[PDB]
Design a protein around this nucleic acid. Structure first.
Ligand code: TMP
Ligand code: MN
Ligand code: MN
Ligand code: MN
Length: 676
DNA sequence: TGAGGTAGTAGGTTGT
DNA sequence: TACTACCTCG
DNA sequence: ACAACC
């Protein structure tokens, strides 16, 4: 195709030695379990037995494969699972050769490779080993804490029969003191804490003045002798009474608690510039390679293609959405905005007034600025003021306020939403020279009033693009969809989300949401779209889009479905020259990496991994549209999002519905991006 | 609540 | 998934 | 348990 340069890149992967003739013929084992596992427990049981055997062994089909000879294995024993007891016996059955060309057998080989890496790393010193991560050096150290530097690794087997090493530098934050000693250093309370005696964590709420030897526990025991009776005080001291929270406040001891340290609990930048991350990636790869007898690492190369530069349009061409404030909007209607001040002051700050007037003047659209002379503490009278403002044509409200606590922020926003009013919060004190902050607030306000601040100018295969995501922080989730309608993406819409149990969006929900976007397109363009681009956040669960694809096909609407994965893309580095944006790296059929955003100061970019799950549009064209769609987001004035706009929008939508609840959205217009 | 991504920290679902 | 620190403003 | 995502 017509690319803007064919270049070569390094992946953080490394080619290593071919598997030797022993490794290609692992020892096979038949598994006998007594009692036989239930349907639910069979695979975890086989895996558990594989772990229990020792050496380097994994599950292979209904049986086992090992790179250790059975004479150093534990072939018989006893398992506990979910409160049961299984006797296991392993019967050696010789060795069967595995073909790397065959993806199943290659999968078994790769499981073995990973196990190999685990085991050989565990036998090392002196390095901190955690799973597939290795922390070698000490990056930083403070009173009672330290940050280790190392790398997260993976090891698998290519179809040519060789080892492949993945490496990505990582840091790990360690506390080495008890909650007692920790607070005994002047350090303030950690938000989260772990038991000293096992892995369970709690949310630390406050300290108590109570006596542990006198605090009754449900059941008769006191705190102190409860923990004593379990042998937890055998080797340490009780300390004070910490009140932690249930996953209902719960008593605990400061002597039996270890803070879990985050960045909030601690000048330490843990993001690396891409040159340094590349360099360390190599260092650690060669190190691993030499320590494990896996050969000299060969960095793998891939053909990359530079995508065309996106042309962002306001009233005229812009390089960033914030420019639409000086130049004018892509499409500006007659608008009314209202002001709500919670800081006891009066009227619109003059520079905000001037900026808004300037933008709308450049757009040639009229602007009315209202003021809410009411306050949330008035109760229902406040709601009546909101209603009246809505009746007078106010589309969204700017809230000037001191920083609000999360719950108050949520309550106020939800309340305004119930009167059909999206809100943009802007914190005071606010100086005129804090330009990025209040210009971004204004862009938020405007998208929330339903204006199109920018659009795309290019030509794309799909004239409707819709993103699907699931969100919410509870036992249930909201599945939702957002969309850009028209080839220019000159209309951004959300749809009413749906509650669901998990990550999978029900097939009927997927289709009903999609149909809503089709209908939005119909309302805008007076016709059905020729082709639609379906974007799924993360993986597509099996058959999730089946009904939707069937429905689209019945209507004669073409489609492409792309899984968009925010991790698993690894790292990409330039072979020569500077690292740039808009990088398309085709890996295998229907799969490719896309480097959508990057700034040097911002650390090392994490390229997206994309899978073309259905449709016949060429990979380059999809890469082109998704990359350009990344530039459509209106509410970020100075930095484009990594995700294409429909997904970024969908993510924010289901996040906000998760926070506020869906019950507030009935009177909010779907063109008003209330969640940005 | 200014925004973004990269970083860290905790956890979860899908599915073999 | 979702939180916060950091750094800077296509 | 484990993998590959969230
Ligand atoms: C046994 C028991 C413990 N607890 C609290 C005290 C311990 O600090 C906390 C955690 O105990 P655990 O780690 O054994 O689960 O549970 C109660 O609140 N009620 C009880 O009946
Ligand atoms: Mn998601
Ligand atoms: Mn999301
Ligand atoms: Mn916002």
């Amino acid at each position: 195709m017509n690319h803007l340069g064919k270049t070569e890149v390094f992946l953080n992967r490394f080619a290593l030695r071919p598997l030797n003739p022993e490794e290609l013929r692992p020892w096979r084992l038949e598994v006998v379990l007594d009692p036989p596992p239930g349907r639910e427990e069979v695979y975890p049981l086989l895996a558990q037995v594989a772990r229990r055997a020792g050496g380097v062994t994994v599950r292979m089909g209904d049986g086992l494969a090992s790179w250790s000879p059975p004479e150093v294995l534990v072939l018989e024993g006893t398992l506990a699972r979910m409160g049961q007891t299984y006797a296991y016996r392993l019967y050696p059955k010789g060795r069967r050769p595995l073909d790397p060309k065959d993806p199943g057998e290659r999968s078994v080989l790769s499981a073995l490779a990973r196990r190999l890496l685990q085991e050989r790393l565990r036998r090392l010193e002196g390095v901190w080993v955690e799973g597939l991560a290795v922390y070698r050096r000490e990056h930083a150290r403070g009173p009672g804490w330290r940050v280790l530097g190392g790398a997260v690794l993976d090891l698998w087997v290519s179809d040519s029969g060789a080892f492949l090493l993945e490496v990505d530098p990582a840091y790990r934050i360690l506390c080495e003191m008890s909650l007692e000693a920790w607070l005994a250093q002047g350090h303030p309370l950690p938000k989260r804490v772990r038991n000293a005696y096992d892995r369970r964590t709690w949310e630390l709420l406050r300290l108590g003045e109570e006596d542990p030897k006198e605090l009754p526990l449900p059941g008769g025991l006191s705190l102190l002798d409860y923990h004593a009776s379990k042998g937890r005080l055998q080797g340490r001291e009780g300390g004070r009474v910490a009140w932690v929270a249930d996953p209902k406040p719960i008593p605990h001891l400061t002597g039996l608690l270890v803070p879990v340290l985050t960045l909030e609990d601690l000048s330490l930048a843990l993001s690396l510039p891409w040159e340094e991350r590349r360099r360390r990636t190599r260092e650690i790869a060669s190190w691993i390679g030499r320590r494990l007898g896996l050969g000299t690492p060969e960095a793998v190369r891939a053909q990359a293609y530079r995508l065309s530069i996106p042309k962002l349009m306001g009233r005229r061409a812009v390089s960033k959405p914030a420019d639409a404030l000086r130049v004018g909007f892509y499409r500006a209607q007659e608008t009314a905005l209202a002001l709500l001040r919670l800081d006891g002051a009066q009227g619109w700050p003059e520079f905000l007034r001037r900026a808004l007037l300037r933008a709308f003047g450049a757009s040639g659209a009229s602007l009315r600025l209202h003021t809410l002379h009411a306050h949330p503490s008035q109760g229902l009278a406040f709601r009546e003021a909101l209603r009246k403002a809505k009746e007078e044509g106010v589309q969204a409200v700017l809230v000037l306020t001191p920083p609000m606590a999360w719950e108050d922020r949520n309550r106020l926003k939800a309340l305004l939403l119930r009167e059909g009013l999206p809100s943009q919060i802007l914190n005071v004190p606010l100086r005129e020279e804090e330009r990025h902050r209040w210009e971004n607030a204004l862009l938020g306000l405007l998208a929330k009033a339903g204006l199109q601040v920018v659009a795309l100018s290019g030509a794309y295969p799909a004239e409707l693009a819709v993103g699907f995501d699931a969100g919410g922080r509870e036992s249930f989730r909201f599945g939702g969809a957002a969309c850009a309608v028209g080839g220019d993406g000159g209309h951004l819409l959300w749809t009413l989300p749906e509650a669901q149990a998990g990550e999978r969006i029900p097939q009927e929900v997927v289709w009903d949401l999609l149909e809503e976007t089709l209908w939005a397109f119909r309302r805008k363009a007076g016709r059905l779209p020729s082709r639609v681009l379906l974007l799924r956040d993360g993986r597509v669960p099996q058959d999730e889009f089946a009904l939707a694809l069937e429905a689209l096909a019945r209507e004669g609407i073409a489609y492409d479905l792309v899984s968009v994965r925010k991790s698993g893309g690894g790292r990409v580095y330039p072979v020569q020259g500077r690292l740039a944006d808009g990088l398309y790296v085709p890996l295998e059929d229907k799969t490719f990496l896309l480097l959508t955003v990057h700034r040097d100061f911002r650390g090392t970019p994490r390229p997206l991994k994309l899978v073309h799950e259905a449709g016949d549009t060429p990979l380059e064209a999809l890469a082109h549209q998704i990359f350009h769609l990344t530039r459509l987001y209106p509410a970020s004035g100075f930095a484009f999002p990594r995700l294409p706009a429909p997904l970024h929008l969908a993510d924010r939508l289901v996040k906000e519905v998760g926070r506020l609840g869906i019950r507030h959205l009935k009177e909010v217009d779907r063109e008003k991006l209330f969640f940005v």
